[PDB]
């Protein structure tokens, strides 16, 4: 039902190793569909999902012009931020930006986003009102004044409420067979003895899309949050994701444990136990 589009920009300086690299990637939910890399042999916007390939030459040239312009603006921004923080010309620094729109199950705009960071710390972000900025410090206040003088927020708001939603809806239609298809997890429980009196119960979830999932262990119906080893959701490399949750249980006490799985692709939530 719910869908989102995001662009992720990374601009990285590398003193003594050439000009700053600019890389932009575009996503619909957990599916990447475009890339641009200023370090590429011939920098151009490239398709990364089959449903975007149908876009005409004018689409590709428009994207490439935008990302070439961003490559140059981010090079100036890196020089500016180095100055705002009184940094030496020696260190490598990174500006990151993530922006886009969220749609509800009705296809209506839920909210817009635009956030920037410097060296992995929040720097400046567009407020949920799409009208004002949240500057993290006195350096970010300079950017804020610059962005206010250029009327960035008004232009970004028009984009987030207009073109962003329009293009997201177009992509969702063109890629409906994948983007609007939720693949449920394939699940199982494995048992691994750790001692004479203890064994690990591992609950697996494989081949699911989108990445959002909840995997929990309960002992006698109560959540085992502190006792659960939960790995980060990981990409299988074929669009799907994987996750596991593990508990160390006393041997003979296995049947008191249940694994609970919640995912959009499932007709109804799952309750699993070790099946010896």
């Amino acid at each position: 039902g719910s869908h989102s589009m995001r662009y992720f920009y990374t601009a990285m300086s590398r003193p003594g190793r050439g000009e700053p690299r600019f890389i932009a990637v575009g996503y619909v939910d957990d599916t990447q569909f475009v890339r641009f890399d200023s370090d590429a042999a011939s920098p151009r916007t490239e398709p990364r999902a089959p449903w975007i390939e149908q876009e005409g030459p004018e689409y590709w040239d428009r994207n490439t012009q935008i990302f070439k312009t961003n490559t140059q603006t981010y090079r100036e921004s890196l020089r500016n931020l180095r100055g705002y923080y009184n940094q030496s010309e020696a260190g490598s620094h990174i500006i990151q930006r993530m922006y886009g729109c969220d749609l509800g199950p009705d296809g209506r705009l839920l909210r817009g986003h635009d956030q920037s960071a410097y060296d992995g710390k929040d720097y400046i972000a567009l407020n949920e009102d799409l009208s004002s900025w949240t500057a993290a410090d006195t350096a970010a206040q300079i950017t804020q004044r610059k962005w206010e003088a250029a009327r960035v927020a008004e232009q970004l708001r028009a984009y987030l409420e207009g073109l962003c939603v329009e293009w997201l809806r177009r992509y969702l239609e063109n890629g409906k067979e994948t983007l609007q298809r939720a693949d449920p997890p394939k699940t199982h429980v494995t048992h691994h003895p750790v001692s004479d009196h203890e064994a690990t119960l591992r609950c697996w979830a494989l081949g699911f899309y989108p990445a959002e999932i909840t995997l929990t262990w309960q002992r006698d119906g109560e959540d085992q949050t502190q006792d659960t080893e939960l790995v980060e959701t990981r990409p299988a490399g074929d669009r799907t994701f994987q996750k596991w949750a593990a508990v160390v249980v006393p041997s003979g006490e296995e049947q008191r444990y249940t694994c609970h799985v919640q995912h959009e692709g499932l007709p109804k939530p799952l309750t699993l136990r070790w099946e010896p």
Binding site: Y59, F67, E76, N80, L156
Partner: peptide, 9 residues
């Protein structure tokens, strides 16, 4: 489609 205005920070 990305936002088209690039503004120096």
């Amino acid at each position: 489609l990305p936002f088209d205005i690039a503004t120096i920070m």
